[PDB]
Scaffold this active site. Structure first.
Site, mmCIF file in Angstrom:
data_model
loop_
_atom_site.group_PDB
_atom_site.id
_atom_site.type_symbol
_atom_site.label_atom_id
_atom_site.label_comp_id
_atom_site.label_asym_id
_atom_site.label_seq_id
_atom_site.Cartn_x
_atom_site.Cartn_y
_atom_site.Cartn_z
ATOM 1 N N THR A 84 0.804 -1.209 0.000
ATOM 2 C CA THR A 84 0.000 0.000 0.000
ATOM 3 C C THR A 84 0.844 1.269 0.000
ATOM 4 O OG1 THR A 84 -0.062 0.066 2.405
ATOM 5 C CG2 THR A 84 -1.811 -1.165 1.283
ATOM 6 N N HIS A 85 0.189 2.386 -0.288
ATOM 7 C CA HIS A 85 0.818 3.691 -0.102
ATOM 8 C C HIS A 85 1.287 3.864 1.341
ATOM 9 C CE1 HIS A 85 -1.468 4.712 -3.833
ATOM 10 N NE2 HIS A 85 -0.463 5.540 -4.037
#
EC number: 3.1.-.-
Length: 90
Positions: A84-85
């Site tokens: 994920t970011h």
């Protein structure tokens, strides 16, 4: 000839994506495009160089919140992180 590399963290990241029920075929497809030097990547990947702490690396979108960070030079392709970011940049 370009070396293909995986960071130690990359293998952990791949295992975590598997555990979290991500569609691994999407990552495999993108990885294969890079390994084969099939460039430029399709636009849907939003591929771009990174700045900040990831200067020298690139960012491609496997999915809207599933990122691949990799390095590409004449000598090497290195798969660095995926997730994920929040995990990769936070």
């Amino acid at each position: 000839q370009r070396d293909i590399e995986y960071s130690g963290q990359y293998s952990k990241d791949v295992k975590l994506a598997q555990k979290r029920h991500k569609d691994m075929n999407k990552l495999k497809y993108l990885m294969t495009l890079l390994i084969n030097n099939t460039l430029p990547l399709p636009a849907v990947y939003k591929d771009h160089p990174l700045q900040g702490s990831w200067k020298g690396y690139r960012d491609a979108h496997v999915e809207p919140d599933w990122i691949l960070i990799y390095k590409l030079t004449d000598k090497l392709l290195r798969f660095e992180r995926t997730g994920t970011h929040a995990a990769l940049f936070g």
